[PDB]
Coordinates of C-alpha atoms in Angstrom, one line a residue:
Chain A
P2 CA -65.6 -79.8 -18.3
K3 CA -67.7 -76.7 -17.4
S4 CA -68.8 -75.6 -13.9
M5 CA -70.9 -72.2 -13.2
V6 CA -71.0 -70.2 -9.7
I7 CA -74.5 -69.0 -8.4
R8 CA -75.6 -67.7 -5.5
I9 CA -79.0 -68.9 -5.8
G10 CA -78.9 -70.8 -2.7
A11 CA -79.2 -67.4 -0.4
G12 CA -82.2 -65.8 -0.3
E13 CA -80.4 -62.6 -0.6
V14 CA -77.0 -61.5 -1.7
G15 CA -74.4 -59.0 -0.1
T16 CA -71.3 -57.5 -1.4
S17 CA -69.0 -60.0 0.6
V18 CA -70.6 -63.1 -1.0
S19 CA -70.9 -61.3 -4.5
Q20 CA -67.1 -60.7 -4.3
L21 CA -66.3 -64.1 -2.7
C22 CA -68.5 -65.5 -6.0
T23 CA -66.4 -63.5 -8.4
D24 CA -63.0 -64.7 -6.9
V25 CA -64.3 -68.1 -7.1
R26 CA -65.5 -67.7 -11.0
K27 CA -61.9 -65.6 -11.6
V28 CA -60.6 -69.3 -10.2
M29 CA -62.9 -71.1 -12.6
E30 CA -61.8 -69.3 -15.9
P31 CA -62.1 -70.4 -18.8
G32 CA -64.4 -72.6 -18.4
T33 CA -66.9 -70.6 -16.4
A34 CA -69.8 -67.8 -17.6
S35 CA -68.2 -64.7 -16.1
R36 CA -71.5 -62.2 -17.3
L37 CA -73.6 -65.1 -15.1
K38 CA -76.0 -62.1 -13.4
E39 CA -78.1 -63.4 -10.5
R40 CA -81.7 -62.4 -10.6
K41 CA -84.3 -62.6 -7.3
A42 CA -87.0 -64.7 -9.4
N43 CA -84.6 -67.2 -11.1
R44 CA -84.2 -70.5 -9.1
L45 CA -82.0 -73.9 -9.1
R46 CA -84.6 -75.6 -11.8
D47 CA -83.9 -72.7 -14.1
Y48 CA -80.3 -72.7 -13.2
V49 CA -79.8 -76.5 -14.0
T50 CA -82.4 -76.2 -17.0
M51 CA -79.9 -73.7 -18.4
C52 CA -76.9 -76.1 -17.1
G53 CA -78.4 -78.6 -19.5
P54 CA -78.0 -77.7 -23.0
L55 CA -75.3 -75.5 -21.9
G56 CA -72.9 -78.8 -21.4
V57 CA -72.1 -77.4 -17.7
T58 CA -70.8 -80.2 -15.8
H59 CA -70.8 -78.5 -12.1
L60 CA -72.5 -76.0 -10.1
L61 CA -71.0 -74.5 -7.2
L62 CA -73.9 -73.0 -5.2
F63 CA -73.4 -70.0 -2.6
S64 CA -75.9 -69.7 0.1
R65 CA -76.5 -67.9 3.1
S66 CA -78.5 -69.0 6.0
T67 CA -80.8 -66.7 8.1
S68 CA -78.4 -67.3 11.0
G69 CA -75.7 -65.7 8.5
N70 CA -74.1 -68.9 8.2
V71 CA -72.7 -69.7 4.6
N72 CA -72.8 -73.0 2.6
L73 CA -70.8 -73.8 -0.5
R74 CA -72.7 -76.7 -2.1
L75 CA -70.6 -78.5 -5.0
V76 CA -73.2 -80.3 -7.3
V77 CA -72.5 -82.3 -10.3
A78 CA -74.5 -81.5 -13.6
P79 CA -77.6 -82.5 -14.3
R80 CA -78.2 -85.1 -11.6
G81 CA -76.2 -84.6 -8.7
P82 CA -74.2 -85.6 -6.6
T83 CA -74.7 -82.8 -4.3
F84 CA -71.6 -81.8 -1.4
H85 CA -72.4 -79.5 1.6
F86 CA -69.4 -77.4 3.0
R87 CA -70.0 -74.9 5.4
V88 CA -68.2 -71.8 5.5
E89 CA -65.9 -71.4 8.7
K90 CA -63.0 -68.3 7.7
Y91 CA -62.7 -66.8 4.2
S92 CA -60.7 -63.8 3.0
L93 CA -61.6 -61.6 0.1
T94 CA -59.3 -61.6 -3.1
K95 CA -58.9 -57.6 -2.6
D96 CA -58.2 -58.5 1.0
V97 CA -55.4 -61.0 0.1
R98 CA -53.7 -58.7 -2.5
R99 CA -53.6 -55.7 0.0
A100 CA -51.9 -57.8 2.9
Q101 CA -49.5 -59.0 -0.5
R102 CA -46.6 -57.2 -0.2
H103 CA -46.3 -57.4 -4.3
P104 CA -50.0 -58.5 -5.3
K105 CA -49.8 -60.2 -8.7
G106 CA -53.2 -58.9 -11.3
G107 CA -54.5 -61.0 -13.0
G108 CA -53.7 -61.3 -17.0
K109 CA -52.9 -63.5 -20.0
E110 CA -53.4 -66.3 -17.4
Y111 CA -57.1 -66.4 -17.3
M112 CA -56.7 -68.5 -20.6
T113 CA -55.5 -71.4 -18.6
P114 CA -57.0 -73.0 -15.6
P115 CA -54.8 -74.0 -12.4
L116 CA -53.5 -77.4 -11.7
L117 CA -55.1 -79.4 -8.7
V118 CA -52.9 -80.0 -6.2
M119 CA -54.4 -82.2 -3.6
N120 CA -52.5 -82.7 -0.1
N121 CA -53.7 -85.4 3.0
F122 CA -56.5 -87.0 1.8
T123 CA -56.6 -90.9 2.4
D124 CA -57.3 -92.7 -1.0
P125 CA -55.9 -96.7 0.2
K126 CA -56.8 -97.9 3.4
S127 CA -55.0 -97.8 6.3
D128 CA -57.3 -98.7 9.2
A129 CA -60.1 -100.0 7.3
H130 CA -62.5 -97.5 9.1
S131 CA -64.2 -97.4 5.5
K132 CA -67.0 -94.8 6.4
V133 CA -64.8 -91.9 6.6
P134 CA -62.3 -93.3 3.9
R135 CA -64.1 -95.5 1.5
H136 CA -67.3 -93.4 1.5
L137 CA -66.3 -89.9 1.6
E138 CA -62.7 -89.2 0.8
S139 CA -62.7 -91.2 -2.8
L140 CA -65.5 -89.3 -3.6
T141 CA -64.0 -86.1 -2.7
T142 CA -61.0 -86.6 -5.1
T143 CA -63.1 -88.0 -8.1
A144 CA -65.3 -85.1 -8.0
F145 CA -62.3 -82.3 -7.6
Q146 CA -60.5 -84.6 -10.4
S147 CA -63.6 -84.2 -12.4
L148 CA -64.2 -80.4 -11.4
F149 CA -60.8 -79.5 -13.0
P150 CA -60.4 -80.8 -16.7
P151 CA -58.0 -84.2 -17.0
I152 CA -54.4 -82.9 -16.8
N153 CA -51.7 -85.2 -18.8
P154 CA -48.6 -84.3 -17.9
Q155 CA -47.4 -85.6 -20.9
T156 CA -49.1 -83.1 -23.4
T157 CA -49.7 -79.8 -20.9
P158 CA -47.7 -77.1 -22.1
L159 CA -45.5 -75.9 -19.4
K160 CA -45.5 -72.3 -20.2
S161 CA -49.4 -72.5 -20.3
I162 CA -49.3 -73.4 -16.6
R163 CA -49.2 -71.1 -14.5
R164 CA -51.9 -71.1 -11.6
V165 CA -52.6 -73.9 -9.2
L166 CA -55.5 -74.8 -6.6
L167 CA -54.4 -76.1 -3.3
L168 CA -56.6 -78.1 -1.6
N169 CA -55.3 -79.6 1.8
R170 CA -56.9 -81.9 4.3
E171 CA -56.2 -81.4 8.2
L172 CA -57.0 -85.0 8.8
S173 CA -54.4 -88.2 9.4
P174 CA -55.3 -91.7 7.4
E175 CA -55.8 -92.7 11.1
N176 CA -59.5 -91.1 11.1
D177 CA -57.6 -88.2 13.6
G178 CA -57.8 -84.8 13.2
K179 CA -60.1 -81.7 12.8
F180 CA -61.2 -82.8 9.4
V181 CA -60.7 -79.2 7.8
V182 CA -60.4 -78.4 4.1
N183 CA -58.5 -75.6 2.9
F184 CA -59.1 -73.9 -0.1
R185 CA -56.3 -71.6 -1.7
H186 CA -55.2 -70.2 -5.1
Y187 CA -51.5 -69.7 -5.8
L188 CA -50.3 -68.3 -9.2
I189 CA -46.7 -69.5 -10.7
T190 CA -44.0 -67.3 -11.7
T191 CA -40.8 -68.5 -13.2
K192 CA -37.8 -67.6 -12.3
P193 CA -33.8 -68.4 -14.0
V194 CA -31.7 -69.4 -11.3
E195 CA -32.4 -75.2 -16.9
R196 CA -32.5 -74.8 -13.0
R197 CA -35.9 -72.7 -12.3
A198 CA -37.4 -71.4 -9.3
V199 CA -41.2 -71.7 -8.8
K200 CA -42.3 -69.1 -6.6
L201 CA -46.1 -69.1 -5.5
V202 CA -47.8 -65.6 -5.2
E203 CA -51.5 -66.0 -3.2
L204 CA -54.4 -65.0 -5.1
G205 CA -57.5 -65.6 -3.1
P206 CA -59.7 -66.6 -1.9
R207 CA -59.1 -68.4 1.1
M208 CA -61.3 -70.7 2.2
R209 CA -62.1 -72.9 5.2
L210 CA -64.4 -75.9 4.5
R211 CA -66.2 -78.1 6.8
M212 CA -67.3 -81.3 5.0
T213 CA -71.2 -81.1 6.8
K214 CA -73.0 -83.3 4.3
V215 CA -73.9 -85.2 1.3
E216 CA -76.7 -85.9 -1.4
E217 CA -77.4 -88.3 -4.2
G218 CA -78.9 -85.9 -6.5
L219 CA -79.2 -82.2 -6.8
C220 CA -80.4 -81.0 -3.7
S221 CA -82.3 -84.0 -3.4
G222 CA -81.7 -87.5 -2.1
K223 CA -80.9 -90.0 0.9
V224 CA -78.5 -88.1 3.5
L225 CA -75.5 -90.7 2.9
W226 CA -73.2 -89.2 5.3
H227 CA -74.1 -86.4 7.9
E228 CA -71.5 -85.2 10.6
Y229 CA -73.6 -84.7 13.5
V230 CA -77.0 -87.2 12.3
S231 CA -76.0 -90.7 11.7
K232 CA -79.5 -92.4 10.7
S233 CA -80.6 -95.7 12.2
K234 CA -81.0 -99.1 10.3
Chain B
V24 CA -50.5 -63.7 18.9
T25 CA -52.2 -67.1 18.3
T26 CA -53.3 -65.7 15.3
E27 CA -50.0 -65.0 13.7
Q28 CA -49.0 -68.0 14.6
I29 CA -52.2 -69.2 12.7
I30 CA -50.1 -67.4 10.0
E31 CA -47.0 -68.7 10.3
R32 CA -48.5 -71.8 9.9
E33 CA -50.1 -70.9 7.2
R34 CA -46.7 -70.0 5.3
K35 CA -45.9 -73.9 6.6
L36 CA -48.9 -75.1 4.5
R37 CA -47.7 -72.6 1.7
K38 CA -44.2 -74.1 1.6
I39 CA -46.1 -77.7 1.7
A40 CA -47.8 -76.6 -1.7
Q41 CA -44.8 -75.1 -3.2
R42 CA -42.9 -78.2 -2.5
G43 CA -45.9 -80.4 -4.4
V44 CA -46.0 -77.5 -7.4
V45 CA -42.3 -77.9 -7.7
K46 CA -42.5 -81.5 -8.2
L47 CA -45.0 -81.7 -10.4
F48 CA -43.0 -79.0 -12.4
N49 CA -39.5 -80.7 -12.8
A50 CA -41.8 -84.0 -13.0
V51 CA -43.7 -82.8 -16.1
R52 CA -40.8 -81.1 -17.8
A53 CA -38.0 -84.1 -16.9
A54 CA -40.7 -86.6 -18.3
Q55 CA -41.3 -84.5 -21.5
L56 CA -37.8 -84.2 -22.7
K57 CA -37.1 -87.4 -21.6
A58 CA -40.1 -89.1 -23.5
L59 CA -39.3 -87.1 -26.8
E60 CA -35.4 -87.1 -26.5
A61 CA -36.1 -90.8 -26.5
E62 CA -38.7 -91.1 -28.9
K63 CA -36.5 -89.0 -31.7
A64 CA -33.8 -91.3 -30.8
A65 CA -34.5 -93.2 -33.7
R66 CA -33.7 -93.3 -37.3
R67 CA -34.8 -90.4 -40.1
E68 CA -38.4 -91.5 -39.6
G69 CA -38.3 -93.8 -37.3
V70 CA -37.7 -98.0 -37.7
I71 CA -41.4 -98.5 -38.7
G72 CA -42.9 -95.2 -39.7
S73 CA -46.5 -96.4 -39.9
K74 CA -47.2 -95.3 -36.9
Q75 CA -49.4 -98.0 -35.5
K76 CA -46.1 -99.3 -33.7
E77 CA -45.2 -96.0 -32.7
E78 CA -47.9 -94.5 -30.9
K79 CA -48.0 -97.6 -28.6
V80 CA -44.5 -97.6 -28.0
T81 CA -44.6 -93.7 -27.3
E82 CA -47.5 -94.3 -24.4
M83 CA -45.2 -97.2 -23.0
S84 CA -42.7 -94.6 -23.0
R85 CA -44.3 -92.0 -21.3
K86 CA -45.5 -94.5 -18.8
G87 CA -42.3 -95.8 -17.8
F88 CA -40.9 -92.3 -17.3
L89 CA -43.6 -91.2 -15.2
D90 CA -43.5 -94.2 -13.2
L91 CA -39.9 -93.9 -12.8
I92 CA -40.3 -90.1 -11.8
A93 CA -43.4 -90.9 -9.5
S94 CA -41.3 -93.2 -7.8
Chain C
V12 CA -47.6 -94.4 -85.6
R13 CA -48.3 -92.6 -82.3
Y14 CA -47.3 -93.7 -78.8
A15 CA -49.3 -93.2 -75.9
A16 CA -47.6 -91.6 -72.5
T17 CA -45.7 -94.1 -70.8
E18 CA -46.5 -94.7 -67.5
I19 CA -44.4 -93.0 -64.2
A20 CA -41.4 -94.8 -63.3
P21 CA -42.6 -97.7 -60.6
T22 CA -39.6 -96.6 -58.5
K23 CA -40.9 -93.2 -58.7
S24 CA -44.6 -94.3 -58.0
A25 CA -46.7 -95.8 -55.1
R26 CA -49.4 -97.9 -55.6
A27 CA -52.8 -98.7 -53.3
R28 CA -55.8 -100.8 -53.7
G29 CA -58.5 -101.6 -51.3
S30 CA -61.2 -104.0 -52.3
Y31 CA -64.5 -105.0 -51.4
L32 CA -64.8 -102.1 -49.0
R33 CA -68.2 -101.7 -46.9
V34 CA -69.0 -98.3 -47.7
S35 CA -71.4 -96.5 -50.4
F36 CA -70.1 -96.5 -53.7
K37 CA -71.4 -92.9 -54.3
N38 CA -69.9 -91.4 -51.5
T39 CA -66.7 -93.1 -51.7
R40 CA -66.5 -91.5 -55.2
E41 CA -67.5 -88.3 -54.2
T42 CA -64.8 -87.7 -51.7
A43 CA -62.3 -89.6 -54.0
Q44 CA -63.4 -86.9 -56.5
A45 CA -63.1 -83.7 -53.9
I46 CA -59.8 -85.3 -52.8
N47 CA -58.2 -86.0 -56.2
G48 CA -54.8 -84.3 -57.7
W49 CA -53.8 -83.0 -54.4
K50 CA -51.1 -82.8 -52.0
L51 CA -50.6 -85.9 -49.1
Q52 CA -50.4 -83.5 -46.4
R53 CA -53.4 -81.5 -47.7
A54 CA -55.6 -84.4 -48.8
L55 CA -55.3 -85.7 -45.2
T56 CA -55.4 -82.5 -43.4
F57 CA -59.2 -82.5 -45.5
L58 CA -60.0 -85.8 -44.6
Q59 CA -59.5 -85.1 -41.2
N60 CA -61.3 -81.6 -41.3
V61 CA -64.1 -83.7 -43.1
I62 CA -64.7 -86.1 -39.4
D63 CA -63.9 -82.9 -37.6
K64 CA -67.1 -81.6 -39.5
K65 CA -65.2 -78.6 -40.6
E66 CA -64.5 -78.8 -44.1
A67 CA -67.1 -80.1 -46.7
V68 CA -67.1 -82.4 -49.6
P69 CA -69.2 -81.2 -52.4
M70 CA -71.5 -83.5 -54.6
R71 CA -71.1 -83.0 -58.1
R72 CA -72.4 -86.2 -60.2
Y73 CA -74.4 -88.2 -57.6
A74 CA -75.7 -85.1 -55.8
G75 CA -78.8 -85.2 -53.5
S76 CA -80.0 -82.1 -51.6
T77 CA -78.9 -82.0 -48.1
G78 CA -77.2 -79.2 -46.9
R79 CA -76.3 -75.7 -48.2
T80 CA -74.3 -73.8 -45.8
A81 CA -71.2 -71.4 -46.3
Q82 CA -68.8 -74.6 -46.9
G83 CA -69.5 -74.7 -50.3
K84 CA -68.4 -71.6 -51.4
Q85 CA -64.5 -72.7 -51.7
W86 CA -65.8 -75.5 -54.3
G87 CA -68.6 -73.5 -55.8
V88 CA -70.9 -75.8 -55.3
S89 CA -74.2 -75.5 -53.6
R90 CA -74.7 -79.1 -52.4
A91 CA -72.0 -80.2 -49.9
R92 CA -72.2 -83.1 -47.3
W93 CA -69.4 -85.1 -44.7
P94 CA -68.8 -88.8 -45.7
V95 CA -67.6 -90.1 -42.7
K96 CA -66.6 -93.5 -43.1
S97 CA -65.4 -92.8 -46.6
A98 CA -62.9 -90.2 -44.9
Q99 CA -61.9 -92.7 -42.7
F100 CA -61.1 -95.3 -45.2
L101 CA -59.5 -93.2 -47.8
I102 CA -57.1 -92.0 -44.5
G103 CA -56.1 -95.3 -43.9
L104 CA -55.6 -95.9 -47.8
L105 CA -53.6 -93.1 -48.5
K106 CA -51.5 -93.9 -44.7
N107 CA -51.2 -97.7 -46.4
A108 CA -49.5 -96.1 -49.9
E109 CA -47.7 -93.5 -47.8
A110 CA -46.2 -96.5 -46.0
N111 CA -45.7 -98.6 -49.3
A112 CA -44.0 -95.5 -50.6
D113 CA -42.1 -95.2 -47.8
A114 CA -40.9 -98.8 -48.0
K115 CA -40.0 -98.3 -51.8
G116 CA -37.7 -95.3 -50.5
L117 CA -39.3 -92.2 -51.9
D118 CA -39.4 -88.6 -50.4
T119 CA -42.2 -88.4 -48.1
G120 CA -42.2 -84.4 -48.5
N121 CA -43.5 -84.7 -52.1
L122 CA -46.3 -87.3 -52.6
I123 CA -49.2 -86.1 -54.5
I124 CA -52.4 -88.2 -55.6
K125 CA -52.0 -88.6 -59.5
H126 CA -55.2 -91.1 -59.7
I127 CA -57.8 -92.2 -57.4
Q128 CA -60.3 -94.6 -59.3
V129 CA -63.6 -95.9 -57.3
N130 CA -65.3 -98.9 -59.2
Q131 CA -68.5 -100.9 -57.8
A132 CA -68.1 -104.0 -55.9
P133 CA -70.3 -107.6 -56.3
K134 CA -73.8 -106.4 -54.3
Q135 CA -73.8 -108.2 -50.6
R136 CA -76.7 -110.7 -52.0
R137 CA -78.9 -110.3 -48.4
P138 CA -85.4 -106.4 -51.6
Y139 CA -82.6 -104.4 -49.7
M140 CA -78.9 -104.1 -51.7
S141 CA -75.1 -103.2 -50.3
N142 CA -73.2 -101.2 -52.5
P143 CA -69.6 -102.0 -51.7
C144 CA -66.5 -100.4 -53.6
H145 CA -63.0 -100.9 -54.8
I146 CA -60.8 -97.9 -54.8
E147 CA -57.3 -97.8 -56.2
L148 CA -54.9 -94.6 -56.1
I149 CA -51.6 -94.2 -57.5
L150 CA -48.9 -91.7 -56.0
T151 CA -45.6 -90.1 -56.9
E152 CA -43.2 -87.9 -56.4
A153 CA -43.6 -84.5 -57.6
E154 CA -41.8 -84.0 -61.4
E155 CA -38.6 -82.9 -61.4
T156 CA -37.6 -80.0 -63.9
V157 CA -33.4 -79.6 -64.3
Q158 CA -30.9 -77.5 -65.6
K159 CA -29.5 -77.5 -68.9
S160 CA -25.8 -77.2 -69.5
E161 CA -25.3 -74.5 -72.2
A162 CA -24.7 -76.2 -75.9
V163 CA -20.9 -75.9 -76.9
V164 CA -20.3 -74.8 -80.6
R165 CA -18.4 -77.3 -82.6

């Protein structure tokens, strides 16, 4: 499982989005191309035709609209699906380190991918309102479970286990809530109190995602569910 | 004020993530240690030693301990 | 008269036979010659690497020029390939031999392949004829050399 983070979605790039994408790539290490330098003449076609032979399975695209709104498109190579998230609030890794009293610099931990922890997403039916649960949430779970390599607790070295990626859903299984996606990154510190204490340190970035819209293919296909626009039958 | 309250909610869900990380931690450690001890609890080279039976036994073992720790 | 060298002790030895196997005789012969005379763990890891495309079996007698890579340096042969089904069935047969030796009560640590013979099998009468093979391999614990007691004069 390989993933790449690209800014080709935006017409032009700035310092803030560049730092955000650098942080996202750092999160995606070691299964990502760090030296990927985006150029203005490049396009989604060129990047997917690079993903093809490179065996990349997942692609994050950071786009910026003329209004300044930022969108994160999580696509699965090489034929979709596509998930449109909207940026509500974001913080840089530099800002997180500055705010933290004891920031920790990335090190040998770059060799190990983070473990995915997923909270408040409703897989089983609680109200038979299948349209949000049985259409969107299971796809979210599968999409991230495939974004990160499958984790076998019975073979994973605990000393290699060093990073965690939190996806917390502000939403209840009764389809009541703010439908907010919380993306965060934490570093594991194991302290001997065998009884071991696990302390999690913010690494960033903090991401506030609005689950806006979906596509079957790579930036193509019928709208399967759009929050604001429901198409008649 | 309101922002500050947002950051106490921040540490709240931070502690929720901490509990999740800790439970995954001790679940993995206990499952691995117990399954390895159980599989080593045999004869010098096991009762069978042909490895086709032990692979399936080891799979059933991690599965039982994983289910027991999960619920 | 002359006496032929006696066979190694059956309870220091282990035998394995596979008859009517549906793998090419030339490929099986080449793989057997490559793995002949080696340590058991060495042979198993070698065949696993052959499956994993890591190490190559050199062709000497039944050699058809297919690959000329750097993997042939360790054998000094310029023609090396990767017999997959050969490696897999031979792994199965040495695993069977190891199980037989364990049943007989031999030291698993010191099994070495003294003998491996590949013969042709009756042709599969289907003009396109298949070439099945018979493979028999004989393993032993490493030969043991022990101390002398000092001779007493009298």
